[PDB]
Amino acid sequence: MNTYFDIPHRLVGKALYESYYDHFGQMDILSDGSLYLIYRRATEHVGGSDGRVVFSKLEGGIWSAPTIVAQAGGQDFRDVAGGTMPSGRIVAASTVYETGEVKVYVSDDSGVTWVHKFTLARGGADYNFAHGKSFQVGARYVIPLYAATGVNYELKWLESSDGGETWGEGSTIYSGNTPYNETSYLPVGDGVILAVARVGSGAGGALRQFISLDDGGTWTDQGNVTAQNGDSTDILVAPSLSYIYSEGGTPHVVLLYTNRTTHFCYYRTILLARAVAGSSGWTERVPAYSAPAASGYTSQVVLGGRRILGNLFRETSSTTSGAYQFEVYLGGVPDFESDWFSVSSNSLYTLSHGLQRSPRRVVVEFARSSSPSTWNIVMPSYFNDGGHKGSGAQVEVGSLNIRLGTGAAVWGTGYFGGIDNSATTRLATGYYRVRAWI
Amino acid sequence: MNTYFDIPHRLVGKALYESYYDHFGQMDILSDGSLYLIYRRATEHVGGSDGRVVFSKLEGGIWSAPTIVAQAGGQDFRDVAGGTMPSGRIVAASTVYETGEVKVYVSDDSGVTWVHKFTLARGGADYNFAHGKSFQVGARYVIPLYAATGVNYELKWLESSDGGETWGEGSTIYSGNTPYNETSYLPVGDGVILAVARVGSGAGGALRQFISLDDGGTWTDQGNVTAQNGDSTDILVAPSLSYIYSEGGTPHVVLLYTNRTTHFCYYRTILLARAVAGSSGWTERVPAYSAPAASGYTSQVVLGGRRILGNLFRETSSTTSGAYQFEVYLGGVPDFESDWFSVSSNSLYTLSHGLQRSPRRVVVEFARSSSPSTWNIVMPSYFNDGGHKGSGAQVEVGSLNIRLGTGAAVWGTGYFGGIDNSATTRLATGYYRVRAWI
Amino acid sequence: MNTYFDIPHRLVGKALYESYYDHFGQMDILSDGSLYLIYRRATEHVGGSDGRVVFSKLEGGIWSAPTIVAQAGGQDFRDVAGGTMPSGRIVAASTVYETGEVKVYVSDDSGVTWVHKFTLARGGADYNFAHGKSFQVGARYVIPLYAATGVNYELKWLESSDGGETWGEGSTIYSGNTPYNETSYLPVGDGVILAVARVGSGAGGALRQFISLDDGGTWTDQGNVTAQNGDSTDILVAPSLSYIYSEGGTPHVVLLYTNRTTHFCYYRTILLARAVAGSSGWTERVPAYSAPAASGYTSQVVLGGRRILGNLFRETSSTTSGAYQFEVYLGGVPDFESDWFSVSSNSLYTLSHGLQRSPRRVVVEFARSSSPSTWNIVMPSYFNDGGHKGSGAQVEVGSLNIRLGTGAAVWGTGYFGGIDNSATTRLATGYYRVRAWI
User: Secondary structure of chain B in the HEC alphabet?
Assistant: CCCCCCCCCCCCCCEECCCCEEEEEEEEECCCCCEEEEEEEECCCCCCCCCEEEEEEEECCEECCCEEEECCCCCCEEEEEEEECCCCCEEEEEEECCCCEEEEEEECCCCCCCEEEEEECCCCCCEEEECCECEEECCEEEEEEEEEECCEEEEEEEEECCCCCCCEEEEEEEEECCCEEEEEEEEEECCEEEEEEEECCCCCCCEEEEEECCCCCCCEEEEECEECCCCCCCCEEEEEEEEEECCCCCEEEEEEEEECCCCEEEEEEEEHHHHHHCCEEECCCEEEEECCCCCEEEEEEEECCCEEEEEEEEEEECCEEEEEEEEECCCCCCCEECCCEEEECCCEEEEECCCCCCCCEEEEEEECCCCCCEEEECCCEEEECCCEEEECEEEEEECCEEEEEECCECECCCCECCCECCHHHCECEEEEEEEEEC
**In which element (H, E) is residue C154 found?**
strand C152-160
Sequence length of chain C is 438
8 A C-beta contact, residue B257 and residue B238: yes
The amino acid occupying position A40 is: R
What is the three-state SS of chain A? Answer: CCCCCCCCCCCCCCEECCCCEEEEEEEEECCCCCEEEEEEEECCCCCCCCCEEEEEEEECCEECCCEEEECCCCCCEEEEEEEECCCCCEEEEEEECCCCEEEEEEECCCCCCCEEEEEECCCCCCEEEECCECEEECCEEEEEEEEEECCEEEEEEEEECCCCCCCEEEEEEEEECCCEEEEEEEEEECCEEEEEEEECCCCCCCEEEEEECCCCCCCEEEEECEECCCCCCCCEEEEEEEEEECCCCCEEEEEEEEECCCCEEEEEEEEHHHHHHCCEEECCCEEEEECCCCCEEEEEEEECCCEEEEEEEEEEECCEEEEEEEEECCCCCCCEECCCEEEECCCEEEEECCCCCCCCEEEEEEECCCCCCEEEECCCEEEECCCEEEECEEEEEECCEEEEEECCECECCCCECCCECCHHHCECEEEEEEEEEC
* Best residue in C6, C415, C422, C425 for a mutation probing chain B (most B CBs within 10 Å): C415
Pairing of strands A429-437, A341-344: antiparallel
8 A C-beta contact, residue A70 and residue A35: no
8 A C-beta contact, residue C419 and residue C376: yes
Measured between CA atoms, the residue of chain B closest to residue A31 is B2
- Tell me the C-alpha to C-alpha distance, in Å, between residue B311 and each of B295, B325, C76, C145, C274: 11, 4, 58, 53, 45
8 A C-beta contact, residue B298 and residue B313: no
Neighbours of chain C (3+ CB pairs under 8 A): A, B
C-alpha span between C133 and B195 (Å, rounded)? 37
User: Which residues precede gaps in chain A, with C-N > 2.5 A?
Assistant: none
- Say whether C419 and B396 touch across the interface (CB within 8 A): yes
Q: Is C263 helix (H, G, I), strand (E, B) or coil?
A: coil
Nearest to C411 by CA among C430, C394, C395: C430
Q: Is C274 helix (H, G, I), strand (E, B) or coil?
A: helix
Question: What's C271's DSSP letter?
Answer: E
CA torsion sign, C321 to C324 to C328 to C329? negative
Burial class (CB in 10 A: 0-12, 13-18, 19+), A64: middle
Question: What's C273's DSSP letter?
Answer: H
Q: What are phi and psi of A273, to 5 degrees?
A: -55, -40
Strands (E), C368-428: 374-377, 381-384, 388-391, 393-398, 401-406
- Say whether C363 and B361 touch across the interface (CB within 8 A): yes
Q: What are phi and psi of A423, to 5 degrees?
A: -60, -30
Sequence length of chain A is 438
C-alpha span between C255 and C274 (Å, rounded)? 14
Q: How many CB atoms lie within 10 A of CB A220?
A: 11
Pairing of strands C67-70, C192-199: unpaired
Q: What are phi and psi of C326, to 5 degrees?
A: -160, 180
- CA–CA min distance C394, chain A (Å): 7
Q: Where does residue A222 fall: left (phi above 0), alpha (psi -120 to 50 degrees), or beta otherwise?
A: alpha
C-alpha span between A247 and B307 (Å, rounded)? 8
- CA–CA min distance C317, chain B (Å): 27
* Best residue in C10, C302, C333, C383 for a mutation probing chain B (most B CBs within 10 Å): C10
Angle at B55 between CA B53 and CA B60, to 5 degrees: 155
- CA–CA min distance C233, chain B (Å): 23
- CA–CA min distance A43, chain C (Å): 28
Pairing of strands B280-282, B226-227: parallel
Q: Which residues of A touch B29 (CB under 8 A)?
A: none
The amino acid occupying position C105 is: Y
Q: What share of chain C is helix, strand, coil (3-state, %, to 5)?
A: 0, 55, 40
Q: Where does residue B264 fall: left (phi above 0), alpha (psi -120 to 50 degrees), or beta otherwise?
A: beta
8 A C-beta contact, residue A136 and residue A215: no
- Say whether A58 and C393 touch across the interface (CB within 8 A): no
CB pairs under 8 A between A and C: 199
Q: What are phi and psi of A235, to 5 degrees?
A: -80, 115
Question: What's C10's DSSP letter?
Answer: -
- Say whether C413 and B273 touch across the interface (CB within 8 A): no
Neighbours of chain A (3+ CB pairs under 8 A): B, C
8 A C-beta contact, residue A359 and residue C384: no
Nearest to C353 by CA among C333, C330, C376, C334: C334
* Best residue in C394, C401, C435 for a mutation probing chain A (most A CBs within 10 Å): C394
8 A C-beta contact, residue B159 and residue B173: no
Buried b / exposed e across C177-215, counting CB within 10 Å, b at 16+?
Answer: eeebbbbbbbbbbbbbbbbbbbbeebeebbbbbbbbbeb
- Say whether C376 and B396 touch across the interface (CB within 8 A): yes
Nearest to A303 by CA among C31, C302, C332, C366: C302
Q: Is C424 helix (H, G, I), strand (E, B) or coil?
A: helix
- Cβ neighbours for A424, distance < 8 A, ≥ 6 positions apart: A414
C-alpha span between A21 and A240 (Å, rounded)? 21
* Minimal Cβ distance to B374: which of A214, A301, A396: A396
Q: Is C275 helix (H, G, I), strand (E, B) or coil?
A: helix
- Cβ neighbours for C271, distance < 8 A, ≥ 6 positions apart: C250, C251, C252, C281, C335, C336
Q: How many CB atoms lie within 10 A of CB B438?
A: 24
Q: How many CB atoms lie within 10 A of CB B401?
A: 16
Buried b / exposed e across C266-303, counting CB within 10 Å, b at 16+?
Answer: bbbbbbbbbbbeebbbbbbbbbbbebeebbbbbbbbbb
Q: What are phi and psi of C297, to 5 degrees?
A: 65, 75
C-alpha span between B276 and B213 (Å, rounded)? 9
Q: Is C227 helix (H, G, I), strand (E, B) or coil?
A: strand
Question: What's C65's DSSP letter?
Answer: P
**In which element (H, E) is residue C198 found?**
strand C192-199
- Say whether B192 and C5 touch across the interface (CB within 8 A): no
- Say whether B307 and A305 touch across the interface (CB within 8 A): yes
- Say whether B418 and A348 touch across the interface (CB within 8 A): yes
* Minimal Cβ distance to A1: which of C31, C248, C355: C31
C-alpha span between A392 and B41 (Å, rounded)? 59
Most distant CA atoms of chain A, gap in Å: 86
- Cβ neighbours for C265, distance < 8 A, ≥ 6 positions apart: C256, C257, C258, C259, C287, C288, C289, C290, C291, C295, C296, C298, C312
- Cβ neighbours for C109, distance < 8 A, ≥ 6 positions apart: none
**In which element (H, E) is residue C121 found?**
none
- CA–CA min distance A9, chain C (Å): 4
The amino acid occupying position A384 is: N
Bridge-partner residues for B307, per DSSP?
B303
Burial class (CB in 10 A: 0-12, 13-18, 19+), A383: buried
Q: Which residues of A touch C403 (CB under 8 A)?
A: 374, 418-419
Neighbours of chain B (3+ CB pairs under 8 A): A, C
8 A C-beta contact, residue C144 and residue C134: yes
Q: Is C276 helix (H, G, I), strand (E, B) or coil?
A: helix
Chain CA centroid to CA A175, Å: 24
**For this experimental structure, what is the resolution in angstroms?**
1.6
Q: Which residues of C touch A7 (CB under 8 A)?
A: 86, 136, 187
C-alpha span between B425 and B391 (Å, rounded)? 11
C-alpha span between C323 and C19 (Å, rounded)? 11
**In which element (H, E) is residue C51 found?**
none
- Say whether C215 and A60 touch across the interface (CB within 8 A): yes
- Say whether C383 and B381 touch across the interface (CB within 8 A): no
The experimental method is X-ray
* Minimal Cβ distance to B405: which of C12, C365, C419: C419
C-alpha span between C239 and C226 (Å, rounded)? 14
8 A C-beta contact, residue B205 and residue B245: no
- Say whether A405 and B418 touch across the interface (CB within 8 A): yes
* Minimal Cβ distance to A189: which of B10, B288, B419: B10
C-alpha span between C170 and C159 (Å, rounded)? 6
The amino acid occupying position C235 is: I
Q: Which residues of A touch B375 (CB under 8 A)?
A: 396-398
- Say whether A192 and B10 touch across the interface (CB within 8 A): yes
- Cβ neighbours for B434, distance < 8 A, ≥ 6 positions apart: B336, B337, B338, B351, B362, B363, B364, B402, B404
Measured between CA atoms, the residue of chain A closest to residue B32 is A86
Q: Which overall architecture, per CATH, does domain C13-327 show?
A: 6 Propeller (2.120)
- Say whether A332 and C247 touch across the interface (CB within 8 A): yes
- CA–CA min distance C388, chain A (Å): 7
8 A C-beta contact, residue A433 and residue A367: yes
Pairing of strands C77-84, C67-70: unpaired
Parse chain A into domains and list their residue ranges. Answer: 13-327, 335-438
C-alpha span between A169 and A135 (Å, rounded)? 15
Q: CB pairs under 8 A, 24+ apart, for B59-62? A: B59/A138, B59/B34, B60/A137, B60/A138, B60/A190, B60/A191, B60/A214, B60/A215, B60/A217, B61/A190, B61/A191, B61/A192, B61/A213, B61/A214, B61/A215, B61/B10, B61/B14, B62/A191, B62/A214
Q: What are phi and psi of B72, to 5 degrees?
A: -160, 130
Q: Which residues of B touch A390 (CB under 8 A)?
A: 381, 413, 415-416, 420
* Best residue in B87, B140, B190, B336 for a mutation probing chain C (most C CBs within 10 Å): B190
- Say whether C10 and B188 touch across the interface (CB within 8 A): yes
- CA–CA min distance C328, chain A (Å): 17
Nearest to B98 by CA among B80, B78, B118: B78
C-alpha span between B115 and B25 (Å, rounded)? 19
Nearest to A144 by CA among A156, A162, A126: A156
* Minimal Cβ distance to A250: which of B1, B7, B329: B329
* Minimal Cβ distance to B417: which of A188, A348, A389: A348
- CA–CA min distance B208, chain A (Å): 25
- Tell me the C-alpha to C-alpha distance, in Å, between residue C328 and each of B417, C34, C256: 44, 19, 10
CB pairs under 8 A between B and C: 199
Domain A335-438 has CATH 1.10.1240.10: no
Q: Is C277 helix (H, G, I), strand (E, B) or coil?
A: helix
* Minimal Cβ distance to B380: which of C4, C11, C379: C379
**CA atoms within 13 A of residue A36's CA, in its CB half-sphere:** 28
8 A C-beta contact, residue C180 and residue C208: yes
- Tell me the C-alpha to C-alpha distance, in Å, between residue B81 and each of A265, B40, B291: 51, 10, 21
